[PDB]
Write a protein that binds this ligand. Structure first.
Ligand SMILES: Nc1nc2c(ncn2[C@@H]2O[C@H](COP(=O)(O)OP(=O)(O)NP(=O)(O)O)[C@@H](O)[C@H]2O)c(=O)[nH]1
Ligand SMILES: Nc1nc2c(ncn2[C@@H]2O[C@H](COP(=O)(O)OP(=O)(O)NP(=O)(O)O)[C@@H](O)[C@H]2O)c(=O)[nH]1
Ligand SMILES: Nc1nc2c(ncn2[C@@H]2O[C@H](COP(=O)(O)OP(=O)(O)O)[C@@H](O)[C@H]2O)c(=O)[nH]1
Ligand SMILES: [Mg+2]
Ligand SMILES: [Mg+2]
Lengths: 336, 290, 290, 285, 152
């Protein structure tokens, strides 16, 4: 039952989110790592300052504050008891972005399996935010915040808070929570991996141009121009440079972790992208298969149907900086 | 007011209009719930004239709700004079008074953009009477601002209330409690895949193949939005009213006309919808241009 | 007055201005969305002279939305008189009454920074009536604070509404998709590439080499801005207004002049824009200065 | 006023014992169980006389305020005049006949904010703090000496709708004082059947009718956390509509199903139409 | 479950072709990749590609791959992921005769039966759905019709 060391996963999430010292923390499990980020992340913000958004308030007060709303004033006859309905702009830290941090901190606190020191600091922080209102979190809340008015820093912790909320399961007690075993399931790990590379490539491969490319079948059908029945085909990543174009398809499988039969079903998808994709520049067309392995990395090259294809692996669990070298090293070989 | 004038031009199926007419005679409090551009406002003016059977303005009244709308204006309230405060009969109070005189003839009140205002603040006491069963003089009530308890207001049975609500906003996930009990929702489909929508285009010098290609794209596009629940619900999906408009001059439909429409209506709308994935905007825009 | 007179100095392509008039005359309400510094305010006063075809100020009205506008101000509200309150017809209601004074000659209402205010509150009843189809006496509607005696307000057909929404501040964006259907959105680009911008620089004693250099450097920056979508989207991209101004005295354009621009205005703008690594700031400032 | 009530006899007696002690009952339950009807009839039983005058009923909404309920300053022609409310007026009537029982029905009590509405008086209306001893000067009272005391005879009955998804947490102020009582749908009961039996409905139609709805009610309660028991459909629709003397049969039933139950399912089940189709089929087929 | 059902459906179709289509010859044949690499001659890492069902006729050879997919059973987007596999089988297979190539996809459906024909890359590929739960005898009669058409 082998999986990636948990600390390394956090780096892939960071690139996955498009944006620290973990040596200190001794809790190997993910929630220990993730909580320390959020718990420290909030503290970094407070030094510079949390977001304060002017929330207009229309309320019944004993006097003129800002703009009086004449209609609500006369209609309710508030003038007679020395009151007006007046609109003014209170400055709070109670914004939707800020509320989400606090509600998640409760979740972090309630988790049964968590480092004691981590919970101690978090319980302090929950206390340190008296004005903010606790909330019952759903994805719909985070959906409203996709506008991204918040700073580049806030969007990081909110992504963390988004991750915890989605990966929270009740445990021994009705109140307390238990963390999901994220690593074990391939689908979410793969979707991380596929997004991890796409965001990784734009940052590091300044040399090449990186786009996910939608592809259309070469087909024509006598019945329909639409071709809805045909599978929708969108590249995982395409990394085009003037000298060579290249499509990569990457997926996380448990079977491949075993050093026997090999799982290469994804390759069936790949060839058809190469065929249906037609280059105007006509420099060359190449493909790459990259999977995560634990112990060691092996690269093979193939000339299958007039296409230059790579089967390759990376030894996640080695070390994160060396991994960065290994990922760039691979793309150098094939891209050229 | 013959149905023949009313129902051909409409894109909505003759099946659904019947269902709409059933509930409206039965319940008298009806809400048409559909996205912008599906003719909610368009039908409601026609439906009123269908039911009455004649084109008369007096028997039909139309208003739009908004946050400023309040009880004091709608039903009864006090308006300042140069100095004094005079009580003033509001719309619904004045309108029902017209309805009392002629009980047999059906009367219609059309309330557009109902979700914007809290119904309780506007109707208030009258949400009790406004329900379909609790109508007629037996359930009469004296109003909040009535000088004496003797004066009473009851929503006569003849009036039917039509409310036009658009599920185009994220806030409406928390639908008001007041609407559901007293009003009966009816869903309006966008209705690209309809015979009558096509026939409107065909009469206006349109190729049959071009029209069907368009329907396949939009039906595909709206289906993509329907899949999501977190960011874009079913109600966000595109209406059929961008394409209807702009052909009055006689300018023939073509990709050129569609190209302006996509660039100036549906492309930025998708920019607002799909902020997080810019490429996803491009995927559709070229597809729609295609 | 005519297109040639207006478009002498405008850096916007002729293509959009005709596209603008194509959508505006059919649809009667539009929005010009572009980053700050692209002449949104500049053209809009000029467009008023085109559609009327004559330079008269009375047929034009210009206002700006300050996130404190309300229905009491725009259309109908109650204002104090000396001791007691009175009803005051707002600006738009005053304008529409002028507009129906003569239907033949078109009337323009220009609303800068429409994006700011809560538009559902301001327009209220007008949100239905503004649209091209829903104009004229057929769609007469009674207002909120209207007199007990029935008086109804309809947007006349002649009126045209133009809005000017900047796309930099993301929060202040129209997400009321019911409302976004009334308006047509015309993106306005920064205007660097066009010669009509360049000719303006050349005529003021400028070397063509530096001019072509300037646009080359800027367009590189805007792509870096446009490529991101998380924080700095397509809309944030830098406008051309900075370079336009300050040369009237006879100051010739040179890197000495550009150096003042970049250090003083753009360089603060960039550090706020990115605010993650200073190195990226140092890169782009030096590129422009280099 | 107790000849045909579909609610079981045990509960309605329990309410009478509960009401005579606590004096403040809230009736939960799905819409369409005659919450107003049982409360209205129960009120007459508590008095023992089917008289309208003693009883008064009001529907709460979010903008219901103390000014409407108790005391407010509405304008006359020239100047502001204090205007008695509903409850205040109601109690002045109750003081006349302390021996007799006066009863106040408050519909949709959960919807409004109790505190802004009741104001000062919320402390008094609790059964303990009642009578002359606990009299308090009211907020708008010009003279301190005049006070308002809730008499012991007054009993407050509240109707609360369980069905709404919008509801998350009940108001604290409500729960401390009022004793919530749950009204079951009572779709399967003797009196409801016997009511239907006296009307032209055969026994098979009854068992068909009770059986098919019972599974639907059972289904929603089964998914307890997903949806509460109280969402389960009531019986009031089947009661109503037979005043015309029409024989109740499957031909008649299909109208109520399609007109009344079908939108209710549509609103309740917004996730899967296929699930809706399953349950509509069984009722008729 | 679906994996059992999908694996079942393949076997049910395979023998079904053996019994009913006495005229045609039906086999499940192992295929080899075009690929040549210096690193590995055996190409062991690459997936084993085995046809689900191959029926051969003088005019052409027909390859079919069919599976049970949950989404198609319900009433939108089409879950036809296996089409990627089909081309790779056809592309990899170069028949000695070279006359023609045959492709079909058949899916289990409950409500309705649909048939389409596609020319994608110059290759004959067809997608159809058959209603299931109608009745065993006529459904068998229905399946026979499909094989007749596309085999031509
Ligand atoms: N001719 C014709 N026009 C239609 C039809 N359906 C909608 N329209 C047109 O679409 C335009 C706007 O319709 P409308 O009802 O206002 O949409 P809406 O739902 O009210 N918009 P919103 O939701 O934003 O308030 C009108 O021209 C209307 O007549 C139709 O079936 N036939
Ligand atoms: N002379 C001249 N000036 C132009 C031209 N285009 C833009 N400008 C100038 O750039 C400055 C600002 O234009 P403006 O319309 O206000 O941009 P804006 O988007 O409205 N500004 P904001 O977004 O901040 O409201 C003005 O000096 C304007 O005249 C042009 O083509 N010619
Ligand atoms: N005759 C009779 N009517 C009942 C009975 N139960 C409920 N009803 C009627 O059902 C109708 C609706 O009652 P109610 O719950 O107050 O309506 P609601 O406001 O929608 O909840 C009224 O006519 C009730 O009197 C009953 O047992 N006998
Ligand atoms: Mg409308
Ligand atoms: Mg401006």
């Amino acid at each position: 039952q082998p999986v990636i060391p948990v600390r390394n996963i956090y780096y892939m999430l960071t690139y996955a989110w498009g944006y620290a010292n973990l040596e200190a923390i001794p809790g190997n499990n993910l929630l220990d790592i993730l909580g320390y980020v959020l718990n420290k992340g909030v503290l970094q913000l407070s030094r510079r300052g949390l977001e304060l958004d002017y929330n207009p308030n229309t309320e019944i007060i004993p006097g003129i504050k800002g703009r009086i709303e004449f209609a609500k004033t006369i209609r309710g006859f508030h003038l007679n008891h020395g009151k007006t309905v007046s609109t003014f702009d209170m400055l709070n830290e109670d914004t939707l972005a800020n509320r989400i941090i606090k509600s998640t901190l409760a979740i972090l606190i309630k988790h049964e399996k968590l480092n004691s020191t981590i919970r101690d600091e978090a319980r302090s922080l929950y206390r340190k935010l008296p004005g903010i209102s606790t909330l019952h979190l759903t994805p719909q809340h985070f959906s409203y915040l996709n506008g991204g008015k918040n700073t580049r820093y806030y969007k990081f912790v909110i992504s963390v808070c988004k991750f915890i909320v989605n990966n929270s399961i009740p445990g021994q007690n009705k109140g307390h929570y238990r963390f999901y075993d994220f690593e074990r399931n391939e689908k979410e790990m793969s979707l991380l991996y596929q997004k991890f590379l796409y965001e990784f490539c734009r940052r590091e491969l300044t040399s090449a141009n990186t786009t996910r490319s939608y592809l259309k079948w070469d087909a024509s059908s006598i019945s329909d121009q639409s071709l809805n029945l045909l599978p929708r085909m969108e590249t995982d990543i395409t990394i085009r440079s003037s000298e060579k174009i290249l499509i990569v398809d990457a997926k996380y499988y448990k079977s491949i972790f075993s050093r026997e039969k090999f799982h290469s079903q994804n390759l069936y998808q790949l060839m058809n992208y190469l065929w249906s994709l037609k280059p105007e520049n006509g420099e060359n067309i190449g493909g790459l298969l990259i999977y995560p392995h634990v112990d060691t990395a092996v690269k093979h090259r193939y000339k299958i149907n007039g296409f230059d294809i790579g089967l390759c692996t990376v030894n996640l669990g080695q070390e994160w900086p060396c991994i960065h070298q290994e990922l760039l090293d691979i793309f150098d070989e094939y891209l050229k | 007011y013959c149905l023949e004038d009313a129902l051909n031009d409409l894109f909505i199926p003759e099946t659904t209009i019947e269902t709409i007419l059933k509930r409206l005679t039965i319940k008298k409090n009806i809400i048409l719930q559909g996205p912008p551009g599906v003719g909610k406002t368009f039908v409601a003016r026609r439906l009123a004239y269908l039911l009455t059977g004649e084109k008369a303005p007096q028997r039909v009244n139309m208003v739009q709700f908004h946050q400023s709308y309040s009880y004091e204006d709608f039903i009864q309230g006090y308006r300042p004079n140069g100095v004094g405060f005079r009580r003033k009969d509001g719309i619904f109070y004045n309108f029902c008074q017209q309805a009392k005189e002629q009980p047999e003839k059906k009367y219609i009140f059309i309330i557009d953009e109902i979700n914007r205002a809290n119904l309780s603040k506007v109707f208030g006491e009258v949400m009790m009477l406004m329900e379909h069963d609790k109508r007629g003089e037996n359930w009469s009530v004296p109003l909040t601002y009535s000088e004496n308890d003797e004066e009473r207001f009851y929503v006569p049975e003849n009036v039917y209330i039509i409310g036009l609500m658009n599920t185009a906003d994220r806030s409406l996930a928390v639908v008001d409690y007041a609407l559901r009990r007293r009003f009966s929702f009816i869903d309006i489909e966008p209705g690209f895949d309809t015979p009558q929508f096509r026939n409107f285009l065909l009469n206006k010098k349109a190729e049959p193949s071009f029209v069907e290609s368009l329907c396949q794209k939009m039906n595909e596009l709206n289906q993509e939005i329907s899949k999501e629940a977190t960011i874009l619900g079913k109600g966000f999906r595109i209406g059929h009213s961008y394409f209807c408009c702009g052909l009055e001059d006689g300018t023939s439909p073509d990709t050129q006309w569609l190209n302006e429409i996509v660039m100036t209506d549906i492309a930025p709308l998708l920019e607002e919808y799909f902020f997080d994935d810019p490429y996803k905007q491009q995927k559709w825009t070229n597809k729609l241009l295609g």
